[PDB]
Amino acid sequence: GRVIRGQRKGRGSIFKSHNHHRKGAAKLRHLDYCEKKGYIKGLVKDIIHDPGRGAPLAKVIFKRTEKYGKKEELIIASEGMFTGQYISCGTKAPLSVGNILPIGKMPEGTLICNLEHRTGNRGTLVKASGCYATVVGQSEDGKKTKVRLPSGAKKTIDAKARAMVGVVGAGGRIDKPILKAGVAHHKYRVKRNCWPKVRGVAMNPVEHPHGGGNHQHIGHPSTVSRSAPAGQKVGLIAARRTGLLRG
Amino acid sequence: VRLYKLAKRKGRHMGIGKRKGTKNARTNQKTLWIKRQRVLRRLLKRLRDSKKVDRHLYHSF
Amino acid sequence: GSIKRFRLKQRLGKCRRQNRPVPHWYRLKNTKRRHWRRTKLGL
Amino acid sequence: PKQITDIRKFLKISRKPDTTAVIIMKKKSKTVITKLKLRTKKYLYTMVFADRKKAERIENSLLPSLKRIYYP
Amino acid sequence: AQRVHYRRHNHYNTKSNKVRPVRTPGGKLTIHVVKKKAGKPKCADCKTAIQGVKALRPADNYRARRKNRTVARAYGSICARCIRERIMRAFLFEEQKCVRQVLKE
Amino acid sequence: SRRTKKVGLTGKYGTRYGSSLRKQIKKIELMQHAKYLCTFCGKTATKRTCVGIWKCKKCKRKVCGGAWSLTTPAAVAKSTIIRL
RNA sequence: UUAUCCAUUUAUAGGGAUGAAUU
RNA sequence: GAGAACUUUGAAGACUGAAGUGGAGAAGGGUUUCUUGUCAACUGUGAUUGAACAAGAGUUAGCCGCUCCUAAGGGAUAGCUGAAAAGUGUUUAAAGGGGUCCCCGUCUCAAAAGGGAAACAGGUUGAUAUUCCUGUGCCAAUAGUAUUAUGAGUUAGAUGGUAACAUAUAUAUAAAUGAACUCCUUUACAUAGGCUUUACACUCGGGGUGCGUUUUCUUUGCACUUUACCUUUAUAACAAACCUUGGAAUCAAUUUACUUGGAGAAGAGGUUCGUUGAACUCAAUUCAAAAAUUUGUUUUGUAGCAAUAGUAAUUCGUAAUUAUCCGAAGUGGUAAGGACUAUCCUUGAAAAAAGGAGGGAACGGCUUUGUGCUUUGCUACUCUUAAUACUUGUAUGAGCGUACCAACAACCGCAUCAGGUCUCCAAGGUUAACAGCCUCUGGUUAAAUAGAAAAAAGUAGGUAAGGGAAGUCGGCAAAAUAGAUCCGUAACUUCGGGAAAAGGAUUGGCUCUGAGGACAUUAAUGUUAACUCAGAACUGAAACGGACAAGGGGAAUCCGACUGUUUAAUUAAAACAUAGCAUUGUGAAAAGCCACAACUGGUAUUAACACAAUGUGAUUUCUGCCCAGUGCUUUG
RNA sequence: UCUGAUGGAGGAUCGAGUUGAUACUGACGUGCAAAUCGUUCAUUUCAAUCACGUUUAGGGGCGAAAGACUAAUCGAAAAG
């Protein structure tokens, strides 16, 4: 037939992120001498909204140790921290809401956010609105620690990664149902152009494998193997099962 | 026009058969409320300034 | 357009110059002539 | 234009060599009023006089080295 | 009445091109474009407008006299309430450091 | 008087949308729009400003929080943190 | 650990016990 | 003019009816612009006209824009692929600025609607005007030295106020040390809602001018009676913020609306910003009261720019004189500003450039010892504006656009085609009204033709006795009220509505009654303003939302939950989409989906309340059984 | 709990304008026109409308999806 809408998506023509009003990549303060050998405390001068994500962003002030003057950074805000609160990063810092600590210090059963799956990437995991993670227990010899991610998997990360004590704010955003189409349109304004969905089965029989016929039915098994080519992966991709879940 | 407006001031064409705007269209109930509230509140201000009435009764009214 | 570039104005002058008819006394010894409305210069 | 009231200021600005021309108006108010105007590279300074006597004395007190103009 | 027309070559009513009509000694209604309004200087702490200083545009602020740009008390780009707060905070936290140091021994 | 029996704040939506989705939504905006107490001043004057930021009118000191609840069970882990 | 690959910053300290702070 | 229904002038009747064939502009057109001649062809009819033909003429900017900065972005530099054309654009980069070794750093282009240094009024010609003239300003820059002069500071940097802060008035408020290094601010931002202030517009009564009807009445009906930018323009007034004192519950002040308060309310006294740009005795002044310079009484002035300009009249050589250009108000029709409230799973851009601050590096002048430093001998000197002069290459102000049209025949539609084409201005009456309809300012009386007779037929309408859907596939076209006030309003229902349900009553003219405000005097007397409602008689061919403007309702079933979108030129739906429901894959750079010839890239400035692919389509109650078939997947 | 106010939310209602094309299967259909004219109709605080600039180039783009549109040409454009 022709190229499918599931194929044109990755070409980069109109699916580029609307980066015009984004206030800054969410990144945590990176390594230095002080972080690895003690506490360093800054303050949060302001907290703002980011049009793309849900969780707000904290504009954090810091002072360097080699050049006179300040630096600014944007952190993924966690719940219940206020403007003016002093935020401490490093190893020897006291564990409290909003602070930054290496994974080899806090006890088990403490909620956490902004993990770092490989040390130095300055913040990579658990950043969505209203989400958290929990450490299950450190290694007996150190150097390792397992954490239970929100999806429900136990991942092992070194002890020299960093994380934030507390929970990412803006929790339960999914509770309120969208009523009007306008809310959905406004929401998808500032992320992508993946909306509206448009059912595949009502497509013309040439721009989607699902379409065609006189009763708008799929006509062949919807599940498709993981080894399929680019234009074939369109259904329930290599489904392990179907139907309602049973725990 | 001037003769008709003089008759208008004398009140000769207020007929319902002549009105063609709604009750709220011909005069704003909101604006009439503003006028009423403003005149009575100014009266209360003059009352307190002359000290004819005490503050405790003033606030109640 | 009330706003024009220098080369465009000069080219319009050139075209108006071209629009001039053949002198009389030369004929004693044209066909490429446009009209302001019939043919558009396009430039 | 910049109206000036104090009279010693005007007598000072008259002596300034950068000034060229003076302007004398006469007009009927209700008698005659005058507005002594003075032209200089920066501005044009005017003065109102309800006193014909003061106008008469000041117009001749002004130095002769500058040119005089009357619009009417 | 009369009828008017734009004159400053930009015939749209964008918020940099608003109009205040006036009449002339010639007896005609002309058009003038009033300069766009500008914001006000604000304290760095409370983000609140501070007094003592004019609120012109860039060029007008440059042209303004030095007597219309600052309040003469230490900071001057900080509201008086905030500067007082900073001053006594500055003294007292230093003294707390001193007393903690002396009680350290 | 009491203009409506039970619809309340969701009467703005008119007759559209089902009751199982209007009674459901009404559970949350009632305690969203209502102002909340501020710890820093004790004045119940904290409103919402965006999806996750609350502001006290008196303090002019804003605090992050949940989508619509200033505090939530997922955010009452501060007790576990603070027992140390 | 050198090949190689990945990540990071201005490639800024060898390892253990709501104010500024530059000559 | 030989020629005139369609050239020109006058009379008359009309139209366009401020959403205009009116003014300006943009893109586009490119001399169609103006003048003098002009009829070979064209201007579908005539033609003396012309957007035709011929000959000349016409676009004046330090201030109107471009040029400047930056956006979604483009192009290119280093590297990397590719044989190359090319594709990538910091992915191992020794890659331009400043200070004085240190710090900073891809380049460039992209807006005639964003940000943006600087202008106004009158006059001016055949064709241009914020460009020319006259008059009055403003903006930017101004190299080195030497002279004067203006002002401050000192024997290396001011003051007053307890405070918010204020202070330099020289022609010109220019000068209140200040480096390296830094932190801010401005530039700089959504929508909705009402309130308030000012300006303009409109309207009203008086005064003065001129006009006009005047069988008949008419203190008459119409026009003019004006004042730009600039002077941190001065002040006054107001919305808010702040300061001082003051110290509250019998809670208090307050908005149309809620807002605020021991984190200090009210009262009282002040400070500022912003709105406006002469408000207010504002200015000096004539007169009285305070002392080695303050408060009360008056004159003048359109606060200056200002009348010398316009405008309207009147004389007079035919260029001048003449008198007026002022006591007051109401409407809300726009615009702008202000203070607020509400909404967002939407939070509503940046640099150019400028400002402020923390900080405290360097420090008079003349002469002199010695190796910029210590020194010895005297004290008037340090910074800034203005002008002048001399040396430096000539030491103020670059270039481009500027006529015309904006469709009515100057644009595209094969064309002088009823089509399409982007913004501002926006009068009176009637009225809810920027609707319709009529009129004033301006414009036109022209549309590829005119006179006559009026049949058939067509076509845009009217009207029809009695019947009232009997026609027809089908009440398709039309007819019925429709405005406003008042009365009343069911089944069902998600309790929000249905609902203007259904269904009724009133509706004109003239003459009256009542109610609805602000302002000042020692509870009482006066001054003065809207049209808004409620009622009343009297009257008419019983008619009065008199035209203009404006729902036909009801009983049901099927489909789709709704608002929305779509087959430009045969199908607007029951089709799609949407909110909701549910599934699957995915723990990150050794992952998912996808693009790419390879390098590489988007999702991603991303992280399971996220990304990608799906079917069903509010809500209610449900969502029964089969893993044999084919798929998909799990362990070896 | 019931009554009277103020208040002004709504992908709320009517409706000129803008945007479109429901019906008359009206006119013209050798037309004003290679899609127009009259009456009627739809929409108007938001999934809105327009303008300029800007990106996506053919076995491709783009599509609230009809085999639509991509210069009157589209079940594979146009020039050679």
PDB file of all heavy atoms in Angstrom, chain E residues 3-16:
ATOM      1  N   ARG E   3     -13.735  61.719  10.460  1.00  0.00           N
ATOM      2  CA  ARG E   3     -13.202  60.383  10.250  1.00  0.00           C
ATOM      3  C   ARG E   3     -11.689  60.477  10.176  1.00  0.00           C
ATOM      4  O   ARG E   3     -11.148  61.429   9.609  1.00  0.00           O
ATOM      5  CB  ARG E   3     -13.754  59.754   8.972  1.00  0.00           C
ATOM      6  CG  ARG E   3     -15.214  59.358   9.036  1.00  0.00           C
ATOM      7  CD  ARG E   3     -15.659  58.937   7.660  1.00  0.00           C
ATOM      8  NE  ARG E   3     -17.022  58.432   7.609  1.00  0.00           N
ATOM      9  CZ  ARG E   3     -17.605  58.011   6.497  1.00  0.00           C
ATOM     10  NH1 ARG E   3     -16.967  58.018   5.337  1.00  0.00           N
ATOM     11  NH2 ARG E   3     -18.855  57.565   6.548  1.00  0.00           N
ATOM     12  N   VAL E   4     -11.007  59.489  10.748  1.00  0.00           N
ATOM     13  CA  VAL E   4      -9.559  59.560  10.895  1.00  0.00           C
ATOM     14  C   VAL E   4      -8.893  58.367  10.224  1.00  0.00           C
ATOM     15  O   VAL E   4      -9.568  57.490   9.675  1.00  0.00           O
ATOM     16  CB  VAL E   4      -9.171  59.634  12.379  1.00  0.00           C
ATOM     17  CG1 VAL E   4      -9.823  60.832  13.029  1.00  0.00           C
ATOM     18  CG2 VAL E   4      -9.587  58.362  13.081  1.00  0.00           C
ATOM     19  N   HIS E   5      -7.565  58.327  10.271  1.00  0.00           N
ATOM     20  CA  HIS E   5      -6.811  57.252   9.647  1.00  0.00           C
ATOM     21  C   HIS E   5      -5.458  57.137  10.330  1.00  0.00           C
ATOM     22  O   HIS E   5      -4.931  58.118  10.857  1.00  0.00           O
ATOM     23  CB  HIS E   5      -6.622  57.504   8.152  1.00  0.00           C
ATOM     24  CG  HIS E   5      -6.324  58.931   7.818  1.00  0.00           C
ATOM     25  ND1 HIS E   5      -5.046  59.444   7.824  1.00  0.00           N
ATOM     26  CD2 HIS E   5      -7.140  59.955   7.474  1.00  0.00           C
ATOM     27  CE1 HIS E   5      -5.086  60.723   7.495  1.00  0.00           C
ATOM     28  NE2 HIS E   5      -6.345  61.057   7.276  1.00  0.00           N
ATOM     29  N   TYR E   6      -4.900  55.930  10.306  1.00  0.00           N
ATOM     30  CA  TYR E   6      -3.569  55.717  10.853  1.00  0.00           C
ATOM     31  C   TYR E   6      -2.541  56.517  10.064  1.00  0.00           C
ATOM     32  O   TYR E   6      -2.746  56.853   8.896  1.00  0.00           O
ATOM     33  CB  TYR E   6      -3.214  54.233  10.819  1.00  0.00           C
ATOM     34  CG  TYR E   6      -3.841  53.442  11.933  1.00  0.00           C
ATOM     35  CD1 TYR E   6      -4.016  52.075  11.823  1.00  0.00           C
ATOM     36  CD2 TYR E   6      -4.265  54.064  13.094  1.00  0.00           C
ATOM     37  CE1 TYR E   6      -4.588  51.347  12.835  1.00  0.00           C
ATOM     38  CE2 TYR E   6      -4.841  53.344  14.110  1.00  0.00           C
ATOM     39  CZ  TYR E   6      -4.998  51.986  13.978  1.00  0.00           C
ATOM     40  OH  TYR E   6      -5.574  51.263  14.995  1.00  0.00           O
ATOM     41  N   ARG E   7      -1.422  56.824  10.714  1.00  0.00           N
ATOM     42  CA  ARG E   7      -0.377  57.612  10.079  1.00  0.00           C
ATOM     43  C   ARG E   7       1.022  57.037  10.212  1.00  0.00           C
ATOM     44  O   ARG E   7       1.882  57.382   9.394  1.00  0.00           O
ATOM     45  CB  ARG E   7      -0.372  59.041  10.637  1.00  0.00           C
ATOM     46  CG  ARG E   7      -1.695  59.758  10.490  1.00  0.00           C
ATOM     47  CD  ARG E   7      -1.473  61.211  10.164  1.00  0.00           C
ATOM     48  NE  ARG E   7      -1.358  62.031  11.362  1.00  0.00           N
ATOM     49  CZ  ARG E   7      -0.745  63.206  11.400  1.00  0.00           C
ATOM     50  NH1 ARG E   7      -0.151  63.708  10.331  1.00  0.00           N
ATOM     51  NH2 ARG E   7      -0.724  63.892  12.539  1.00  0.00           N
ATOM     52  N   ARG E   8       1.286  56.173  11.187  1.00  0.00           N
ATOM     53  CA  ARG E   8       2.639  55.719  11.469  1.00  0.00           C
ATOM     54  C   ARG E   8       3.034  54.482  10.672  1.00  0.00           C
ATOM     55  O   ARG E   8       3.909  53.728  11.115  1.00  0.00           O
ATOM     56  CB  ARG E   8       2.803  55.459  12.965  1.00  0.00           C
ATOM     57  CG  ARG E   8       2.786  56.723  13.785  1.00  0.00           C
ATOM     58  CD  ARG E   8       4.079  57.487  13.617  1.00  0.00           C
ATOM     59  NE  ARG E   8       4.162  58.596  14.556  1.00  0.00           N
ATOM     60  CZ  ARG E   8       4.504  58.473  15.830  1.00  0.00           C
ATOM     61  NH1 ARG E   8       4.821  57.298  16.351  1.00  0.00           N
ATOM     62  NH2 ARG E   8       4.526  59.555  16.602  1.00  0.00           N
ATOM     63  N   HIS E   9       2.399  54.244   9.529  1.00  0.00           N
ATOM     64  CA  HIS E   9       2.749  53.250   8.523  1.00  0.00           C
ATOM     65  C   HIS E   9       2.426  51.822   8.963  1.00  0.00           C
ATOM     66  O   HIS E   9       2.535  50.909   8.145  1.00  0.00           O
ATOM     67  CB  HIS E   9       4.230  53.319   8.101  1.00  0.00           C
ATOM     68  CG  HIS E   9       4.556  52.498   6.894  1.00  0.00           C
ATOM     69  ND1 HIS E   9       4.689  51.128   6.942  1.00  0.00           N
ATOM     70  CD2 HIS E   9       4.771  52.854   5.605  1.00  0.00           C
ATOM     71  CE1 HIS E   9       4.974  50.674   5.734  1.00  0.00           C
ATOM     72  NE2 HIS E   9       5.028  51.700   4.905  1.00  0.00           N
ATOM     73  N   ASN E  10       2.016  51.590  10.202  1.00  0.00           N
ATOM     74  CA  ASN E  10       1.627  50.257  10.659  1.00  0.00           C
ATOM     75  C   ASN E  10       0.133  50.281  10.961  1.00  0.00           C
ATOM     76  O   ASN E  10      -0.294  50.713  12.035  1.00  0.00           O
ATOM     77  CB  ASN E  10       2.457  49.819  11.861  1.00  0.00           C
ATOM     78  CG  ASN E  10       2.526  50.868  12.942  1.00  0.00           C
ATOM     79  OD1 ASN E  10       1.904  51.923  12.844  1.00  0.00           O
ATOM     80  ND2 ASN E  10       3.283  50.579  13.990  1.00  0.00           N
ATOM     81  N   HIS E  11      -0.662  49.788  10.012  1.00  0.00           N
ATOM     82  CA  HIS E  11      -2.103  49.990  10.019  1.00  0.00           C
ATOM     83  C   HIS E  11      -2.857  48.923  10.801  1.00  0.00           C
ATOM     84  O   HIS E  11      -4.040  48.686  10.534  1.00  0.00           O
ATOM     85  CB  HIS E  11      -2.623  50.067   8.585  1.00  0.00           C
ATOM     86  CG  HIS E  11      -2.563  51.441   8.000  1.00  0.00           C
ATOM     87  ND1 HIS E  11      -1.375  52.061   7.678  1.00  0.00           N
ATOM     88  CD2 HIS E  11      -3.544  52.320   7.690  1.00  0.00           C
ATOM     89  CE1 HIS E  11      -1.627  53.261   7.190  1.00  0.00           C
ATOM     90  NE2 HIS E  11      -2.935  53.444   7.186  1.00  0.00           N
ATOM     91  N   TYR E  12      -2.211  48.277  11.761  1.00  0.00           N
ATOM     92  CA  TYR E  12      -2.878  47.347  12.654  1.00  0.00           C
ATOM     93  C   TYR E  12      -2.915  47.925  14.060  1.00  0.00           C
ATOM     94  O   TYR E  12      -2.135  48.812  14.411  1.00  0.00           O
ATOM     95  CB  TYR E  12      -2.175  45.989  12.654  1.00  0.00           C
ATOM     96  CG  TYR E  12      -1.915  45.450  11.270  1.00  0.00           C
ATOM     97  CD1 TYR E  12      -0.671  45.582  10.679  1.00  0.00           C
ATOM     98  CD2 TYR E  12      -2.922  44.831  10.548  1.00  0.00           C
ATOM     99  CE1 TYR E  12      -0.430  45.098   9.415  1.00  0.00           C
ATOM    100  CE2 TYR E  12      -2.689  44.339   9.286  1.00  0.00           C
ATOM    101  CZ  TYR E  12      -1.444  44.477   8.723  1.00  0.00           C
ATOM    102  OH  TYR E  12      -1.211  43.990   7.460  1.00  0.00           O
ATOM    103  N   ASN E  13      -3.830  47.403  14.874  1.00  0.00           N
ATOM    104  CA  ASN E  13      -4.052  47.909  16.226  1.00  0.00           C
ATOM    105  C   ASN E  13      -3.341  47.066  17.275  1.00  0.00           C
ATOM    106  O   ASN E  13      -3.860  46.855  18.375  1.00  0.00           O
ATOM    107  CB  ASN E  13      -5.545  48.000  16.518  1.00  0.00           C
ATOM    108  CG  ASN E  13      -6.189  46.648  16.668  1.00  0.00           C
ATOM    109  OD1 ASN E  13      -5.814  45.693  15.993  1.00  0.00           O
ATOM    110  ND2 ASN E  13      -7.166  46.555  17.561  1.00  0.00           N
ATOM    111  N   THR E  14      -2.144  46.576  16.960  1.00  0.00           N
ATOM    112  CA  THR E  14      -1.367  45.806  17.921  1.00  0.00           C
ATOM    113  C   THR E  14      -1.044  46.652  19.148  1.00  0.00           C
ATOM    114  O   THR E  14      -0.973  47.881  19.083  1.00  0.00           O
ATOM    115  CB  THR E  14      -0.075  45.306  17.282  1.00  0.00           C
ATOM    116  OG1 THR E  14       0.747  46.426  16.929  1.00  0.00           O
ATOM    117  CG2 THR E  14      -0.383  44.499  16.037  1.00  0.00           C
ATOM    118  N   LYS E  15      -0.823  45.974  20.276  1.00  0.00           N
ATOM    119  CA  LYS E  15      -0.724  46.646  21.568  1.00  0.00           C
ATOM    120  C   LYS E  15       0.509  47.534  21.678  1.00  0.00           C
ATOM    121  O   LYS E  15       0.777  48.096  22.744  1.00  0.00           O
ATOM    122  CB  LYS E  15      -0.750  45.624  22.706  1.00  0.00           C
ATOM    123  CG  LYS E  15       0.464  44.726  22.796  1.00  0.00           C
ATOM    124  CD  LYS E  15       0.313  43.754  23.954  1.00  0.00           C
ATOM    125  CE  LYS E  15       1.406  42.704  23.941  1.00  0.00           C
ATOM    126  NZ  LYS E  15       2.759  43.313  24.037  1.00  0.00           N
ATOM    127  N   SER E  16       1.272  47.655  20.598  1.00  0.00           N
ATOM    128  CA  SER E  16       2.290  48.686  20.481  1.00  0.00           C
ATOM    129  C   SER E  16       1.846  49.835  19.591  1.00  0.00           C
ATOM    130  O   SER E  16       2.653  50.720  19.291  1.00  0.00           O
ATOM    131  CB  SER E  16       3.582  48.091  19.938  1.00  0.00           C
ATOM    132  OG  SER E  16       3.348  47.432  18.709  1.00  0.00           O
TER     133      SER E  16
END
